[PDB]
C-alpha cells in the first residue's frame, strides 16, 4: 500500500516498500568567502547496533572512501529542546579534497527505532564563531515529529 | 566554484537523471546516499560527469 | 528565520538558503534491479519560463550524460483538482558503459522561480506496473 511522505513543497503517497535515502542539501550565501553548507541524511541501524557503534562504522566508511580523514572531536549531541529532543553523538573531522582541507561537523540521532538521522555542516575552511553558532542554532531548532 | 557549497548545474533534471543511473550502475552510490558519506553526495555526483 | 519540513520533523534555516535537497527512494536489496524514485529542485534563470528551462535541461543532459536520448515530451500534472501543478514530462534513455536506463522526468513551477522535478528510473523498459507507479505518484502530490 501507499503511505504519506512530506517534503517542503507538499506531500505525496509512496509505496511502503520504498526505503527513504533522501539527502537534504541547504546552500547558504557567502560574504567575503564561500559559506558552509548544511546536509541531512538517513541510515538504517544494523541488528543490535547501538548509536556509538553506528558512529564508529561511519568513521570507518569516511576513512575508507576519503583522503586523510581526521577526527578532531567526538561528544554528545542534542537535536531539539524539551521532552521530545533527541540525544545523539557528534564528531568534528577534516579530510583532503584536492589541494584543500574540508571541515565537517556530523551528528547522528536515532529518530525512530532502527533509523538514524544525520545532520552535517561542511565548510571549506576552519570553523569560526559564525559557523559554530549556525551549527548549534540549527540543531536546537529541530522539532521531531511526534 | 565548488558545488558542495555553491549553486551549480547539479540540480533539477540533470541531478535527477544522474541519481537514477548511479543507483543502478555504481555500487559506491549506496554509500554516498546514506549516513555520513552522504554529506558529500554532490561531490560524488560531479565526478560522475567530469 | 524560515521554517523547513522533512518527513522526520521541522526546523528553521537562514533566510536566504537555496534548497538543493534530493529525495531518493529505493527498493533496498534490489536497488540495481528495481525502479527508483527521486525528487530534485532548481531555480529558473531571470526571464526563463518552464518550457525554456526544460529546453536548457535537455541540452545539459545531452552534454553531460552518455548517449542521452529524449523519446517524448508532453504535458504533465502534479496532483489533482484545484491545487494541481502544471508542467511537462519527458521519457528518456541514457547509458553508463553497457548499462542502459529508462527514465521519466516531470518538472513544475512549485512557487515563483522555483522548479520541482520528479524522476522515475528503471533498469528495464517500463512495463504496465512502472507506468502505473508513475501516474499514481504524480497524481497523489498535494502542494502545500
Author numbering:
A (entry chain E): 1 to 146
B (entry chain J): 8 to 57
C (entry chain I): 2 to 145
Question: What's in the article?
Answer:
One such pathway is the type VI secretion system (T6SS), which in many bacterial species functions to deliver antibacterial effector proteins from the cytoplasm directly into an adjacent bacterial cell via a one-step secretion event. In contrast, DUF1795 proteins, also known as effector-associated gene (Eag) chaperones, interact with so-called ‘evolved’ PAAR proteins in which the PAAR and toxin domains are found as a single polypeptide chain. Crystal structures of Eag chaperones in complex with the TMDs of cognate class I and class II effectors reveal the conformation of effector TMDs prior to their secretion and insertion into target cell membranes. Given that the Eag chaperone dimer creates a hydrophobic environment with complementary knob-hole interactions for its cognate effector TM helices, and interacts with TM helices via side chain to main chain hydrogen bonds, we conclude that Eag chaperones provide an environment that mimics transmembrane helical packing to stabilize prePAAR effector TMDs in the cytoplasm prior to effector export from the cell.
However, the EagR1 homologue SciW from Salmonella Typhimurium crystallized in isolation and in the presence of the N-terminus of the class I prePAAR effector Rhs1 (Rhs1NT), allowing us to determine apo and effector-bound structures to resolutions of 1.75 Å and 1.90 Å, respectively. We next compared the conformation of the bound prePAAR-TMD fragments between our effector-chaperone co-crystal structures. Interestingly, despite the abovementioned similarities between the SciW and EagT6 structures, the conformation of the N-terminal fragment of their bound prePAAR effector differs significantly. The first TM helix (residues 19–33) binds to the hydrophobic cavity of one SciW protomer whereas the remaining hydrophobic region of Rhs1, which consists of two anti-parallel alpha-helices connected by a short 310 helix, occupies the remainder of the binding surface. Phenylalanine residues F20 and F43 likely play an important role in the asymmetric binding of Rhs1 to SciW because their hydrophobic side chains insert into equivalent hydrophobic pockets found in each SciW protomer. A lack of interpretable electron density prevented modelling of Rhs1’s entire AARxxDxxxH prePAAR motif in our Rhs1NT-SciW co-crystal structure. Our structural analyses suggest that Rhs1 residues F20 and F43 play a critical role in its asymmetric binding mode because the aromatic side chains of these amino acids insert into hydrophobic pockets present in SciW that are lacking in EagT6.
